[PDB]
């Protein structure tokens, strides 16, 4: 039903799955697949950098959240709600959540919780699309994401 949900889930799931399994999903994208490819490409470049540049904090947050089963993923939806509780929404926060999602999904695979990556990607999508839809739509959705992080030429 919700295209934004679908597309967000597609992008976030692919990134999380791809980051956890190390395998890029060759399966074409659904709709707004141009956007989603570029969003995923953007997610890789920015997301991977977030995980590298904030790996110590991500490890700390991961140890703190202690995400080890599907239930624990709820605890992450809470944290993502907490992210936005100051009323501020921006792509940096959003990509950081997704990046942390990928960080968690990696850890999830090391512990036979690959089954939790889809819930994980789901909860991230849900938080974003359920609670920040208006902002997302206002930012032109994943096109705004791609543009926001687009590396301009000289």
């Amino acid at each position: 039903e919700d295209e934004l949900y679908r597309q967000s889930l597609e992008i976030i799931s692919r990134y999380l799955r791809e980051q956890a399994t190390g395998a890029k999903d060759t399966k074409p994208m659904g709709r707004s697949g141009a956007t989603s490819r570029k969003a995923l490409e953007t997610l890789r470049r920015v997301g991977d950098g977030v995980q590298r540049n904030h790996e110590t904090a991500f490890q700390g947050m991961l140890r703190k959240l202690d995400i080890k089963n599907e239930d624990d993923v709820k605890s992450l939806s809470r944290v993502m709600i907490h992210v936005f509780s100051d009323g501020v929404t921006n792509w940096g926060r959003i990509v950081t959540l997704i990046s942390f999602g990928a960080f968690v999904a990696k850890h999830l695979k090391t512990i036979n919780q690959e089954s939790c990556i889809e819930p994980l990607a789901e909860s991230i999508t849900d938080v974003l699309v359920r609670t920040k839809r208006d902002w997302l739509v206002k930012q032109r959705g994943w096109d705004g994401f791609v543009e926001f992080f687009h590396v301009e030429d000289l």
Binding site: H54, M80, V83, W91, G92, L97, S99, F100
Partner: peptide
């Protein structure tokens, strides 16, 4: 610290 706050701070950095 609270993970959310921490995440927001990182996010606001990534936003730059």
């Amino acid at each position: 610290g609270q993970v959310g706050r921490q995440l927001a701070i990182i996010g606001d950095d990534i936003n730059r």
